Amino acid sequence: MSTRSVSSSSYRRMFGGPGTASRPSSSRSYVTTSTRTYSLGSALRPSTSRSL
């Protein structure tokens, strides 16, 4: 017989389906500004009382 040899390409592995590796968890970011506590002159300003 001329041997019908086993043509042995990568039917064994290199597959496949879970090619979904690094899904972007970066879709969860947490951006926030340098959050201000605001200044107020209300404790710099006393009551200048006029005595008559």
Add this chain to the structure above:
Amino acid sequence: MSTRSVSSSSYRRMFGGPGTASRPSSSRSYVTTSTRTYSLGSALRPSTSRSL
């Protein structure tokens, strides 16, 4: 990352190994060695033995 593919290897995946591509071509013709009850020439010895 590298896919650990325990494949059907690319030497028998497309090549039907042990297997009908390894071709068990065994058509079981029995080699009937036909036994005849005949030694060559035994049917006729013309007997000129008539010793009168």
